[PDB]
Amino acid sequence: DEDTYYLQVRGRKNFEILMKLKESLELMELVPQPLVDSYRQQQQLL
Amino acid sequence: DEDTYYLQVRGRKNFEILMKLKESLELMELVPQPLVDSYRQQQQLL
Amino acid sequence: DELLYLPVRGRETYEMLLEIKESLELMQYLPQHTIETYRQQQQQQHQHLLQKQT
Amino acid sequence: DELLYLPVRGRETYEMLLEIKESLELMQYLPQHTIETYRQQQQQQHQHLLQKQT
Amino acid sequence: GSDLGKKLLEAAQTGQDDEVRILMANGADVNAMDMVGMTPLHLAAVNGHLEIVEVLLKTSADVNAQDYQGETPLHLAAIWGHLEIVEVLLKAGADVNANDLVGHTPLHLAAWSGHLEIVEVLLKHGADVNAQDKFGKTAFDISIDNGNEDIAEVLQKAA
Amino acid sequence: GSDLGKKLLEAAQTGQDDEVRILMANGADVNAMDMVGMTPLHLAAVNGHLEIVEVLLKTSADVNAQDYQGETPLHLAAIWGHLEIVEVLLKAGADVNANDLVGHTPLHLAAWSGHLEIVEVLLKHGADVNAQDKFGKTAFDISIDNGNEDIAEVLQKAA
Numbered sequence: 001d002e003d004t005y006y007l008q009v010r011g012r013k014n015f016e017i018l019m020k021l022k023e024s025l026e027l028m029e030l031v032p033q034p035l036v037d038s039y040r041q042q043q044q045l046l
Numbered sequence: 047d048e049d050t051y052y053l054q055v056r057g058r059k060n061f062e063i064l065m066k067l068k069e070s071l072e073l074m075e076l077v078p079q080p081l082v083d084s085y086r087q088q089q090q091l092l
Numbered sequence: 093d094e095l096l097y098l099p100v101r102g103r104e105t106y107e108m109l110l111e112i113k114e115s116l117e118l119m120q121y122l123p124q125h126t127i128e129t130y131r132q133q134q135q136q137q138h139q140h141l142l143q144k145q146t
Numbered sequence: 147d148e149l150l151y152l153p154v155r156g157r158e159t160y161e162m163l164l165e166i167k168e169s170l171e172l173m174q175y176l177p178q179h180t181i182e183t184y185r186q187q188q189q190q191q192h193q194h195l196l197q198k199q200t
Numbered sequence: 201g202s203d204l205g206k207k208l209l210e211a212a213q214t215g216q217d218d219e220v221r222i223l224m225a226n227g228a229d230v231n232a233m234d235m236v237g238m239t240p241l242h243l244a245a246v247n248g249h250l251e252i253v254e255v256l257l258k259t260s261a262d263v264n265a266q267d268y269q270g271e272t273p274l275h276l277a278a279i280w281g282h283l284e285i286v287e288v289l290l291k292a293g294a295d296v297n298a299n300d301l302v303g304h305t306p307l308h309l310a311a312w313s314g315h316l317e318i319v320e321v322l323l324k325h326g327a328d329v330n331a332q333d334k335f336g337k338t339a340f341d342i343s344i345d346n347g348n349e350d351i352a353e354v355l356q357k358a359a
Numbered sequence: 360g361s362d363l364g365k366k367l368l369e370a371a372q373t374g375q376d377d378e379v380r381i382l383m384a385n386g387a388d389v390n391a392m393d394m395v396g397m398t399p400l401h402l403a404a405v406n407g408h409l410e411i412v413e414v415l416l417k418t419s420a421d422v423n424a425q426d427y428q429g430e431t432p433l434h435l436a437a438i439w440g441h442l443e444i445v446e447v448l449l450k451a452g453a454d455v456n457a458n459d460l461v462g463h464t465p466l467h468l469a470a471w472s473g474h475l476e477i478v479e480v481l482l483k484h485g486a487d488v489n490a491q492d493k494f495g496k497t498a499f500d501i502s503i504d505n506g507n508e509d510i511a512e513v514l515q516k517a518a
Binding site for chain 2: 153165197
């Protein structure tokens with residue numbers, strides 16, 4: 001998906017965790033698929 | 047913390063993960079401290 | 093309810109995942125009256141939707 | 147960079163944590179030019195703050 | 201786990217009396233455990249579902265089952281203020297002095313929550329007022345911490 | 360890990376030339392690994408920091424170090440289009456045919472990204488056009504998938 005969603009969260013520490021995961025989930029999409037595939041292959045070998 | 051924060055996230059699947067964690071993080075605060083303490087003691091024993 | 097084992101490099105990631113996992117599991121201890129009160133609060137929060145203005 | 151071990155009950159929680167952990171770790175593969183482009187996008191997103199109206 | 205076991209856990213949690221009886225009749229494991237090790241009896245106790253507790257107590261379900269945190273159904277009925285459920289669990293042989301992983305008894309948790317009448321029932325069944333938790337604390341100590349002076353008076357008189 | 364090692368990893372990633380030289384002079388581990396097993400040389404290669412790559416290649420840092428995914432610095436310079444870094448890595452003895460965990464060579468990843476000139480340099484250093492990944496795919500196969508017909512022509516001519 002590509003479109004934009006809003007949420008509200010109570011608690012600054014909750015907000016800080018969600019903003020850290022918002023960042024990693026959004027940036028994750030810019031990682032080339034071949035590196036995602038090697039990474040998943042590694043997690044499998046464990 | 048008690049006050050309310052807004053974020054935006056791109057991607058429905060990203061939004062769905064964040065809404066699941068928003069829920070669990072917000073509800074977590076309603077769990078009595080003694081049960082939080084037993085839970086942390088258990089994670090420690092592992 | 094199988095006991096699965098997540099390999100984690102580094103303290104920072106491990107602690108983040110622990111806090112998330114804790115929040116996911118400890119919901120089980122809440123009564124449905126508590127869950128329903130939360131759900132109504134969340135529903136009423138909608139009456140006033142978020143929008144980009146200011 | 148010690149290899150720590152997170153005990154997880156159940157598939158659903160394990161898979162959620164895996165997806166989060168993946169997102170956290172795979173950022174390392176991004177060039178700073180990519181990170182800076184994202185950061186500017188995020189900064190410009192502020193120019194139009196979220197507020198409860200509609 | 202099993203499929204029926206997970207369904208029985210959800211039916212007990214959500215108070216679906218009829219679905220609990222149908223799941224049980226179809227072989228659902230009364231000893232099924234959720235992700236924190238709670239049985240259907242624990243979840244019926246948390247969620248205040250008296251009729252479902254009473255149904256499960258007619259089975260071989262362990263009234264003193266401990267979740268992964270050491271909590272018994274009685275701990276959880278006590279912390280969440282479910283007086284009638286506390287009564288039926290004790291009538292069914294619930295260990296009034298069961299200790300969870302941080303050394304809380306049901307009396308500790310009723311003290312913590314401020315459920316006076318549950319404290320009185322636990323005392324009637326011989327709850328140990330002297331039992332100290334991980335952090336040295338009696339029920340009386342907790343009831344002080346949480347401004348439950350009314351329970352702190354009842355506990356002092358029992359001591 | 361070490362403290363200096365983590366700092367050297369961040370300095371290399373963020374292009375802090377002077378901080379890289381100071382960290383190294385103070386004993387920072389050139390073989391330090393981040394959470395995905397990348398060394399400072401990998402991170403300088405990802406992030407397009409030529410001067411930092413050149414500095415690290417004067418050390419005992421392994422030009423062919425593999426992260427936990429099997430990626431070498433050359434893989435990562437190739438996928439991210441850092442031509443000058445691809446050149447200096449190969450001059451320093453980078454394995455042009457290094458295989459990561461899903462059987463990608465640097466040529467696969469340059470094909471995937473559409474970096475024609477890097478494909479040409481990898482070929483000049485004897486990149487294997489016939490090497491097949493986990494999913495049976497050559498570089499030529501990928502370049503087709505990703506509409507890089509220009510690279511698919513160069514690879515067909517090499518075959």
